[PDB]
Structure formats: structure tokens, C-alpha cells
């Protein structure tokens, strides 16, 4: 549809800021956590991939977030904002698609309602004219009866 | 409501660029201030948390911003843009919610006006038809009197 | 036109996040690839220019992306998101211009419809008045015949 | 006005990405230019302030951009995108304010035009009723003349 196309620039804005959310937390994770957890945060590539695993729910079983929380108790100030902001972006990707569809339906229902009323207005006036003409004929008839 | 749903992608754009503002000023604060103030800016994690305290009005009493200003007189070129842009983003988070509500009310009031007028238009024309029919009948009555 | 003016702030948002996409992948490319490929990723300036060549379809013949893929088999986790997100932004630059034009046309057509109906409504009622007045006159004529 | 408030979240988006435009070119400028031009790009703080001078037109007389162009001939690939993208952001700050005002005027003119037509529609039908009633009275008068 050419109303989904309407919503694509905003989708890229969300998708763009989503990958930027990974990079800023990937750098952050490397400094905070890389020395104690080289396998998970020892580098930017290692951090970006550890963050990816957390978001794709391959971290319930081998839950990277939790052993880091053990060694560093305040580590939730890192993880909780990450999981929240990156879930909220993924949410907005679907919302933008949902809103695009429901907006197109809503606009279509409103043209339906205007021409629905514009039809009723047409028909009510047209049937008044029809009643006018028959009535004006009767007047002219009664007028010839006087002549 | 499913009109607050409509404003969420823009909320995330503001929320995303807000955390972006911390990271860019956290890096800048580390470079400018980390050597003279290692407890406050000696690292990216230290800088990000010093900036957080400033925005959460903790530094109303120990005031991190001001002793840095004292050693570095130009330091307001760092702090003033930070406090302004970060506050303006937090402001836009609430504005986006306020505008979402007031726009839903405004759209309701407009449908209320449009069927208010469409009702008056219907009633005024229906009343004319009623007047028509009683008149037409009287014409036909007087026409019978001539026959 | 002063409706393309309306779409410019969103154009800059796309253009801004596009150059953002280069920088974040330029840093990531340097870390991942700079040691094995110093001519292509040994620095941030080298990485930003290698990414530029890939997007401008220069690497259709010397194909920087592919020998990196050969040494690093996982390298598509870097290249594929890059080519997708950067192309999707460039796409949204043209969409924003297309949507701006088609929306100005759509709004024109709607004013054209609304005065099209407002004209028909005026003419149908004015024609009824004209019918009224000629009728009223004939009533008064026949009323004089009775006097 | 509470329609300027409507436009503020988009203003922050432009203002946000503007400061991000400085930081990414400030890092870029430091690596490309810092070794040969330590006074202008030797650090991130030095680069961010050299970029500021260029944009605030304190670089015609002491034109930092030009001696760098001399030593590095391809340096316009850095400066030209910088000056363009950061001018285009500042432009969009004023456009967002202009569009906010002209939109409020345009919406106000359209309510003026609807109640202008809704008044004409009211008055034309009301004067038809007035002509109805006088006419129906004449019919009843001529009907009593027959009785
Ligand atoms: C984007 C925001 C992401 C939030 C990252 C979490 C905050 C990082 C953090 O915890 O900083 C570590 C605390 O360092 P701290 O400031 O306590 O060090 C004082 C001197 N040793
Ligand atoms: C955001 C984009 C800003 C554009 C920055 C300008 C591009 C930076 C640049 O010129 O890179 C320098 C060229 O390095 P080069 O790739 O030629 O080095 C090859 C191995 N020595």
C-alpha cells in the first residue's frame, strides 16, 4: 500500500536510533565490564554481541546479565535502561505499522461518511423539487380554471 | 488509549536522543575534565554518572558543576548546553503526552460539531417537506372545489 | 513550493542519522577489520571511505566487502545490516519528497470537492427559491381573483 | 501560543542531531587533522571549537578551513558535508517555527470558511421557511373564501 510508504521514514528513525542504542551501550559495557568479563565485554564487537544475545532472549539459560550483576551489584543501572529502551524501540517499529494501517481505514470511513451525508442532502432536496413541480402544476391548473 | 499509542514512536525518538546527549557529553567531559577531576570525569562511567547527578538536582549541595567552573572558567560552554538540551528533551517527553491528549479531545469536538450541523440541516429540510405536504394537500383540496 | 518546506526537518533527521550510521559502522569496522585490513579499515578515515565505496557501488569490481568475508566468515553480520540500513535511509530521503508532493495534490483535490458540493448545494437551494417566488406570485394572483 | 508547543519535540530532534553532527565531525577532524594541526584539531575539545568558529563565520579572516585544504587537498570531503549538514539543521530550526505559525493561521481560516458556508446554508433555508409560511397563509385565506 502507498500509506505504509507514508510511515517508512519514521520507521528508519526508530531503526536508526535502535542500532545507535546498541553502540552506545556496547562502548559503555566494554569500559564498565570488559576487564572482569573479557569474553562478554572485552571488546566492542564482544559487547555488541553480548547485548544482542540478551535482547534475543538467549540469556535465560546462559544469562550473561546475571553473573555480571553478581560481581557488580549496581550493574542494573546499565542493563535495565538497555532492555527497556531497546524493547521500546522494537515496540515502536510494530506500532508505526499498526498506526499506518488503522489510519488508512479511518480516513476511508470518513470519505464514506461525507458522501453518505452528501447523498442524503442531494436526495432530500431533489425530492423537494419533485414536490415543487407537481404543486406548481396544480396551481397553474387552478389558475386556468379562473381565466 | 489508542491515541497515546500514536505518539509513542516520537517519544522514543526523544528518549533515544536523550541518552545520546549523555554519551556525547560524557565522552567530552572525560577529555576536558578527567585529568583534573578523576573522581567526577576520570572515566566514561564516572562522567555519565556525574552528568546524571547534575540533571537530577543532586549537586544542589555538593555542586559538581561549580568547582569545575572554578578551575576551568570556560566550563560553562560545556555545562550550559548540557543542562539546556537535556532539560529540553525531558520537556518534550511530557509535551508529546500532553499534545496526544489534547489532540484526541480536539478531534472528538470536531465530529461533534459536524453531526451537530448535519442534524440541523436534516431537521430544517425535513420541516420544509412537512410544510410542503400540508400545502400540496390544500392545493388539491381547492382544486377539487373547482372540478 | 512551501509544502516541500514542510518536509525538510524530517529530511534532515534522515540525513543526520545516515551520517550517524557511517560513523558507528566506521568505528566498528576499524575494530573488527583494521588489523587484518589496514588499507581498508586501519583507521576511522579509512573505514569511513571504504564504507562509502561500498554504498556507491564502487566494489562491484574490486569488492572490498567480499575478501573481508573470505578471511572473516561472520563478516556479513557487519556488512548486511550496514547496506540495509544505509539504503533504507537513502530510500526515505526520496519517499519524504514524494509524500510531500502527493500530499499537496491530495489536499488540493479535497478543497476542489468541498466547493464542488457547496456549489451544488447553493444552486439547488437557489433554484428552489426561484420556484418558490414564481409560485407565491401565482397564489397572490388567484387571491386577487377572489377579493 | 499552544501551537508552537506542538512543534517543540521536532525542534529538539533537529537540535539534538545538530550537536551530534559536531561530535562526529569533531572526532573525525581530530584523527584526520590533529597531527598536522594540533592547535585546531589536536584534541576533541580543540576540534569541536574549530568547527564552531567555522559555522559562526569567524573563519573568513582567520579561515581555518583553507590552510587545512592547502596541506590536505581532499579536505573538502570533510568540510563541505559539515558546512552543508549543519547549516541545513539550523535552517530546519527556523522552518519548524515558520511552519508552526502558518499552520495555525491556515487552520483558523478553514474554520472561518466552514461557519461562513454553514451560515449561508442556515440563512438560505430560513428564508425559504419564511417564504413558505407567508405562502401557506395565502392558501388558507383563499381556502376560507371557498368554504
Ligand atoms: C546511557 C546511560 C547508560 C547507563 C550506564 C550505567 C552507568 C555507568 C556506571 O555505572 O558508572 C560506574 C560508576 O562509576 P563511579 O562514578 O561511581 O566512579 C567514581 C570514581 N571511581
Ligand atoms: C560523516 C562523513 C564525514 C566525511 C569525512 C571525510 C572522509 C575522511 C577521509 O578523508 O579519509 C581519509 C582517507 O583515508 P584513506 O582511505 O585514503 O587511507 C588509505 C590507507 N592509507
CATH number at residue A126: 1.10.287.70
Interchain CB contacts (distance < 8 Å): A and C:
85
Q: Is residue D119 part of a domain?
A: yes
Breaks in chain A at C–N > 2.5 Å: after which residues? none
Q: Is residue B1 part of a domain?
A: no
CA-CA distances (angstroms) from residue B38 to B41, B61, C28, D26? Answer: 5, 20, 28, 23
Question: Locate cell 546462559: which residue?
Answer: A62
Pocket test for ligand 2, best of D76, D78, D81, D83 (most atoms within 8 A of CB): D78
Pocket of ligand 1 (CB under 6 A): A 24, 28, 32, 74, 77-78, 81; B 19, 22-23, 39, 45-46, 48-49
User: Which residues of chain A make contact with B133, given a CB cutoff of 8 A?
Assistant: 131
Beta carbons of C132 and D134 less than 8 Å apart = no
Distance of CA B29 to the CA centre of its chain: 30
Beta carbons of B92 and D142 less than 8 Å apart = no
- Subunits adjacent to chain B (3 or more Cβ pairs under 8 Å): A, D
Write the residue with the smallest CA distance to atom 8 of ligand 2. Answer: C45
Which ligand lies nearest to the CA atom of residue B41 in the structure? 1
Q: Is residue B65 part of a domain?
A: yes
Q: What is the DSSP string of chain B?
A: -TTHHHHHHHHHHHHHHHHHHHHHHHHHHHHHHTTT-HHHHSSHHHHHHHHHHHHTT--SSS-THHHHHHH-GGGHHHHHHHHHHHHHHHHHHHHHHHHHHHHHHHHHHHHHHHHHHHHHHHHHHHHHHHHHHHHHHHHHHHHHTT-
**Specified resolution (Å):** 2.8
Torsion of CA D39, D42, D46, D47, to 10 degrees: 110
Between helix A76-144 and helix B76-144 the angle, nearest 10°, is 20
Beta carbons of A132 and C134 less than 8 Å apart = no
- Subunits adjacent to chain A (3 or more Cβ pairs under 8 Å): B, C
SS3 C3: coil
Q: Is residue B118 part of a domain?
A: yes
CA proximity to D47, closest of D59, D61, D62, D32: D32
User: Which residues of chain D make contact with B27, given a CB cutoff of 8 A?
Assistant: 23, 44
User: Which residues of chain B make contact with A113, given a CB cutoff of 8 A?
Assistant: none
Q: Is residue D127 part of a domain?
A: yes
Q: How many CA atoms lie within 13 A of D7 on its CB side?
A: 21
Number of structural domains (chain C) is 1
- Distance from residue D124's CA to the centre of ligand 2 (Å): 73
Q: Please, what is the end-to-end C-alpha distance for chain B in angstroms?
A: 70
Report phi then psi at A49, rounded to 5: -85, -30
- Distance from residue B47's CA to the centre of ligand 1 (Å): 7
Contact predicate A53/A46, CB 8 Å: no
Q: Is D20 in the pocket of ligand 2 (CB under 6 A)?
A: no
Long-range contacts of A99-106 (CB under 8 A, 24+ apart): A99/A7, A99/B5, A99/B6, A100/A3, A100/A4, A100/A6, A100/A7, A101/A3, A101/A4, A102/B2, A103/A3, A104/A1, A104/A3
User: Which residues of chain A make contact with B119, given a CB cutoff of 8 A?
Assistant: none
* Greatest pairwise CA separation for chain D in angstroms: 116
Q: Which technique?
A: X-ray
Read off the DSSP letter of residue D72.
S
Distance of alpha carbon C90 from alpha carbon C18, whole angstroms? 8
CA proximity to C82, closest of C55, C122, C117, C101: C55
Range of the domain at D63: 8-136
> In this structure, what C-alpha cell is assigned to residue D117?
458556508
Amino acid at each position: 500500500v502507498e500509506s505504509l510508504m507514508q510511515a517508512l521514514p519514521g520507521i528508519g528513525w526508530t531503526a536508526a536510533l535502535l542500532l545507535m542504542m546498541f553502540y552506545i551501550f556496547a562502548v559503555m559495557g566494554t569500559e564498565l565490564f570488559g576487564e572482569a568479563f573479557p569474553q562478554w565485554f572485552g571488546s566492542l564487537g564482544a559487547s555488541i554481541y553480548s547485548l544482542f544475545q540478551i535482547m534475543t532472549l538467549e540469556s535465560w539459560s546462559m544469562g550473561i546479565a546475571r553473573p555480571v550483576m553478581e560481581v557488580y551489584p549496581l550493574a542494573w543501572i546499565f542493563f535495565v535502561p538497555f532492555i527497556l529502551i531497546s524493547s521500546f524501540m522494537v515496540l515502536n517499529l510494530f506500532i508505526a505499522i499498526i498506526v499506518s494501517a488503522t489510519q488508512e481505514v479511518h480516513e476511508s470511513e470518513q470519505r464514506a461518511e461525507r458522501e453518505a451525508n452528501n447523498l442524503i442532502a442531494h436526495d432530500e432536496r431533489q425530492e423537494m423539487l419533485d414536490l415543487m413541480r407537481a404543486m406548481h402544476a396544480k396551481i397553474v391548473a387552478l389558475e386556468q380554471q379562473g381565466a
